[PDB]
Structure formats: structure tokens, C-alpha cells
Amino acid sequence: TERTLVLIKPDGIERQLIGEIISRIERKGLTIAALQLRTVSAELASQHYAEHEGKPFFGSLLEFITSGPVVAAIVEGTRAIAAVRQLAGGTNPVQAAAPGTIRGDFALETQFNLVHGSDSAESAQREIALWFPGA
Amino acid sequence: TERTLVLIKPDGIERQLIGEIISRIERKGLTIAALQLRTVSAELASQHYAEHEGKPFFGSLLEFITSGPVVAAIVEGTRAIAAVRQLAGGTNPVQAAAPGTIRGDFALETQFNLVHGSDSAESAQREIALWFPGA
Amino acid sequence: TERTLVLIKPDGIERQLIGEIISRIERKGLTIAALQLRTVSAELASQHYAEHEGKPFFGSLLEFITSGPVVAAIVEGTRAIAAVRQLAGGTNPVQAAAPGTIRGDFALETQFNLVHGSDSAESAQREIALWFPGA
Amino acid sequence: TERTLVLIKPDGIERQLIGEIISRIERKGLTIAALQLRTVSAELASQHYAEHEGKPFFGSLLEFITSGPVVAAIVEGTRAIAAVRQLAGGTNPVQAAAPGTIRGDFALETQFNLVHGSDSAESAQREIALWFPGA
Amino acid sequence: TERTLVLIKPDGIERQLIGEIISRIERKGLTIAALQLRTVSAELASQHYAEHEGKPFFGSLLEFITSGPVVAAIVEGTRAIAAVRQLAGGTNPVQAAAPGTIRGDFALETQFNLVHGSDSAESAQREIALWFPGA
Amino acid sequence: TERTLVLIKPDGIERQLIGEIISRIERKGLTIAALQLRTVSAELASQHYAEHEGKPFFGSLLEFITSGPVVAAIVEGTRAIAAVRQLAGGTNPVQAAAPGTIRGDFALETQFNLVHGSDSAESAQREIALWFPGA
């Protein structure tokens, strides 16, 4: 079994999809190991987005994650990592994401993607330590 | 943002899926700009199906759209055109349409496809003028 | 069988519940006889609210129905009138409306009631003539 | 607007209803002000259940809340208190709770009630201070 | 724990509600102990409806249960009997049944009630022996 | 129109998905021709899994199908065979099955696949004779 970090971003909250997203995870058979509505410091935001740190969309990327609170969580279970990304869909909700996924069903813009899921074991271990340093 | 024409055909109505379809559109983040249950004249039907005007399935194609009332609508929003076709699925509901789409979830026959969505900007502009000449 | 007028007010639209409401109606076994997204003139609004014409909440009552478009419809079927009001719930969504109803599930304020349904045969016949004078 | 404390108890979690419950809250128009999966100390449990402190069911009442983690939350909005209790249903899910409520739809036992909601302004203010002393 | 007999009548099947009904039962926490789509002999129908044997609606009552196949089942769990009747709603779907129940959400006529649930321990034991004499 | 055999395996039952699965079938427009919760003899299990009779996973394959009761059914309609497999998804729920399918939405393991659907006309005719020799 694996552990992956999941974020429900400020747009997912504005659109009232916290429970919808969590439900899909639960229904897949995965288990919520940690869960917390929290605010994001300027520091955390950048450390999170270091992969795309130096790039054209960095600015508004941080301003976004910091505009309102977010819901962070540790999702655990068999193939947690791949499964979550499976539920989430591709980055582009119209041309990439399949219908039935979170982004595929609710999203229209690459930017406002509603959700985040660790893209690899390497990332997951790094992001969990980052958002849930205690646990 | 774009505007696209959407039809909920007589079979979509017989099967009580008006609200189900509209909901999926709404949930995607798209907005219903126009909406009307209406009947179809012989003329409108053919002007609509002019693309496939001369073909083997034209007859019953018109007889169908004219058998009962239909629900016409203008759907507006970011990438309205592609998104709607994304929600609708491919023409063949079993071999083409993905599960999660409208046709993929409810349809079994290429003919009885429940729904219509403009396939391009060129078409949308033409079909909207056709169904909602005022608006 | 009966005919009743149903309104999905501007708040029902802002909250993306057109399809949700229509679906509940469909699922009850009732049939959408007429349906149209339309704007409301100052005149229509008052003629509609004549029952509560002279009262303390009249002003903002009209300003509301006229702030954005609404979805009007004629719902037909066995006991259409009572059934629709059954689905809609009592006027106060928290103290009157039962869970499971439209207002009971989605509403919090007596004012923002999302929906309207004719309260009697007398009213229905009057309101249908008013909103769908042709049909 | 009001603030009320909501608990999703260990049975609500075992039965995979976190998102289902949160969704119902969201859909009612209420907003999640705080949210956290957390464990319960022996002390917190009793301070929470002081109202029924001296009684026949106290023992297993505490042992339960402490058997696994729970999801605590602050729910905010118009009539937050009454509305939440409205969504939750009466204590007895079969004879009291109406269909459509959380308990009414999912529960069978008075003990395993899935959810908790502050029963009054007095309680809410006390329980929020208790579970979210910071916020 | 108790055992109760549940019938999904021919109208429940025509309206594609087998899974919807079963789901509601499952979700309540009850368990399907037996389940079978079967036809009804003239004899079984009357033995079932002996309570209302001599009455004005007996004829079409039997003709109905015998018009198409039905889905019979034994539902088991805590307060199975009351809970099932709770999910089913009162006999009259508009004036008696609450929204959120099966009849309350889908039915319009006292006759076409979609579902049946044993009304008492005495009945349950009698009807189970009748429909599932082996089990 | 075609006939296909569908199994809801013991894990589909443990996870309370009987009605969910049946519903998806119904909603696709397919019809339940036969349906029965039943136990599986050692013989039936192997005759069913003869295709993969001689293989590394045979043992626990039979032990599984025989651990608890299962729900067998004959599903009938246009392209019943392909459609059902379409609803079910690929064998591997994470890497193969698309979101929106049964396995895609609920499953995490190739072994615990919740459902079975005949993979061909040849198989269907053979498996129906096997599970429903009378009908």
C-alpha cells in the first residue's frame, strides 16, 4: 500500500466539491489517513511548486494557492498514488481528462484544476513531509 | 468563451433525462444561455441536418426529430463547444463513447443518441441562428 | 391529470440546480409539458405576485424575479399540483420543509426559495395563462 | 449567521460517509469553516459528553469516540445550527429521523448515529471552544 | 435482528428502479439475504393478498402482480421490518409518503406503489415462508 | 439483441454495490432477464473458470467465488455483451479501466474485480446454460 498527498484547492472549495471529491476517493476503496482545512504560507506554496518553480506561470500559481484556505489530506491504500491521479484526470479537463474523472466532470480550465495528487512515490514522500511534517 | 447549440432529442425526453443532461452541463461549469421545449417543423429539421442531407439515413432522421418535442438550448462558457461534445461522447455509445459520458452511460444505439452538440465554431454559429434566430 | 406552473427562480439558476430540479420532477413520473428560460417584465412579476400584492415584502419580491432570467415550465401528470409542492417543500426550508425536498436539501432562507409551484387548481390555471398564454 | 460544531464519528468513517456528509452540508449552502481528522483524548471525550456525563451509557460512549479517529468541523452560515440538525435527523434513525436525513438514510441504531451537531447556541459556542480552541 | 420480505413490483421494474431500491436498502445498513426475479402464480398472488382478500380492489390487485415478473427478496438486519417500511414510505405517495422515501420520490398513485414490505413480524414470517419456502 | 451472463461477486456484495451495479445496467437501457442471489458449488466454480482452468491463480479463484453468495443475472438488450463489458471496465481497475466504469470507480485490485461479464457470444451462451440451465 502507498501514501499520497491530495489537495482540494480554493476553487474546489468555492464550487462546493470537498465532499464530492472525498467521496470519490472513499468509494474507490482508499482511506483518508489525514485531513485538514488550512491556510498556506508564502513559503509552503513555493516549496510545493518547486518542480515548476522557474516558469511563466509561477506567480499566479502561488497567489492562487494562497488566496483562500485549502483542504490537504493523506490518502492511503493499494496503489493510492496511481488511483488518485486516475480519479483526478489529466491536467487539461477538456482535451486530456476523460469524462468520469474529477477534472473531466467539473473543470474547464488547465489553471483551475480543482485538485492535486502526488505524481510519483518520490513526490508523495516529499509533499507529505511538507504538509504533514508531524504525521 | 464560446456558444454552442445543444439538443435533447425526443428519446432523451422519453427516457426522462432532461435534468440529468442539463445537470452535467451545469456541473461542468457551463451556463444555460437559452432553453426551450419546442416542436420542429419539417423545414427546420432538414436545414439542421443539411450536413448529412443527401444520405441513406436522412428520412428517418427527420421523422425522428419531428416525432415529439425537443429541448433546444444555447450553452455558453470556456471551450463550450469541445466540453459539451466531451460530455456527450462519441456517436456510437458502445464502441466509441467512453463510460462517464451521456451516450456512454445511457445509450445503446448510434441512431438513438439522446443528445446533439455543435461539432465546430462554424456549425455552432449556424445552428444557433437557426434555432434561436432572435437571441 | 392536472397541469401546474413551475418556476426555477434566479437563485436556483445561480446555484446550478435547473437540471437537479427538473430531474426530481421527471423522476416522480411527472412530464414537462412546456419549458423556457425567459426574462420577466415588471408587469408579469406583479401579476404573478398579486396574491401577496399589498404586503411588506412586495418590493424586493419583484426586484428579485426581475434581477436575472428564470426557467418557467408547465408540469403535467397525476396530481401534478400536490406532487410538485410535495417535492418543493414548505416555504421555510429549515423549520418547515422536510429533508428530501428541494428547499429542504438546498435552501436556508424563506426569501431565497429556489422554486415556485402553483398552490391550487385555481392558481395553476391562472398562472399558466399568465406565463404561457399561447400553449 | 451562526457557527456550529459537527462531528463525523468513527462509524461514519468506517462506512465511508465523510464526503457524503460534507456534501450534504455544502449543498445546503453552508460553509466548512474548519475541518480536521483527529484523535480524541480521554479528557476531550468526557468534556464533550458532560451533558450526559452521569448516565447509563457514558462508558461505551467515551470508548466509542476514542476507538478510532474522528472528523471535526466548524460549519457556518444562515441558521447553521438548526439546518445541520435538520440534515442529521433525530437521534433514533428508524422511528424519529425522517427519510432524506443522514441518520434516516444510513443509520439503524440510536448508538451508532454517524454524526453529531450542536443542539443549541449555548452548546455550539462551548463545543467549538473545546475542539478548536485556537480558531 | 429481523427478517422481512420485500417485493419490487412490475412497475418498479418497468421504471428501472431495481438497483435504486436495492441500493437504498444496502445503504441503510441492511443486508440482502435472498433475492430472485421470478413469476407469480395465480395461487401465490392471492395467498399474499389474503389480508385484503375480500375487498373492492382484489381483482386488478392480482392481475397486476401477475402481469410481469417481480423481484422478491429477504432483507435482514437491525429493525429490518420498520426500517424497510421507513424507506418505502406510506401507501399514498403524495399525501402520506414523505419526500426521501421510495414512493415519495418516484410514485404518484396509491395503486402503483413500486414496492412492498412486510408490515409486521407476524406478516414477515408468513410471507417469507410463502415466497422462499426453502430458505 | 443479445443475452449475456453477469456476476456480482462476493466483494461486490461485501461493499454494498448490488443496486449500484444493477442500476448502471438498467440506466444503459439493458433489461434484467434473470436475477438470483445464490451459492456456488465447487463444480460450478471450476466449470465457470475453465478458460483459465490450468493457471497460477486458479486455487484462490475458486475459493473466492465460493467464500460467500453471489448475485447471478442474465442481461438482455441491444449489444448486451459489449455494453456490459463497457460498463464494467478492463480487468485492471487502475491502469486499464477508465473512470466512469464499475471497476474504474470502485476497484483497486485485479483480483477483487467486483463484477463479471461474458467476454463473447460463445462464452455467454455457455455460461448462461451453466448458471441458468432452466431459463
Numbering used by the authors:
A (entry chain A), B (entry chain A), C (entry chain A), D (entry chain A), E (entry chain A), F (entry chain A): 2 to 136
Please share text taken word for word from the publication where this structure appeared.
Nucleoside diphosphate kinases (NDPKs) catalyze the reversible transfer of the phosphoryl γ of nucleoside triphosphates to nucleoside diphosphates. The two-step reaction proceeds via a covalent intermediate, the enzyme being transiently phosphorylated on a conserved histidine residue, His117 in Mycobacterium tuberculosis NDPK (Mt-NDPK). Crystal structure of the Mt-NDPK has been solved. It is a hexamer with a tertiary and quaternary structure very similar to other hexameric NDPKs.
One interaction present in Mt-NDPK but missing in other NDPKs, is the intersubunit salt bridge Arg80-Asp93 located on the protein surface. Here, to elucidate the crucial role of that salt bridge for hexamer and overall protein stability, a mutant having the salt bridge abolished (D93N) has been prepared. The aspartate was changed to asparagine since many NDPKs have asparagine in that position. The D93N mutant crystallizes along two different space groups. The overall B-factor values of the two D93N structures (64 Å2 and 71 Å2) are similar and higher than that of the wild type (31 Å2). Analysis of B-factor reveals that (1) two domains, the αA-α2 region (40–70) and the CTerm part (120–136), are highly flexible and (2) the beginning of the Kpn-loop where the mutation is located appears more flexible in the mutant than in the WT structure. Replacement of the Asp93 with the neutral asparagine showed a dramatically decrease of the thermal stability. The chemical denaturation studies with urea and GuHCl as denaturants showed a large decrease in hexamer stability as a result of the D93N mutation, while the stability of the isolated subunit was not affected.
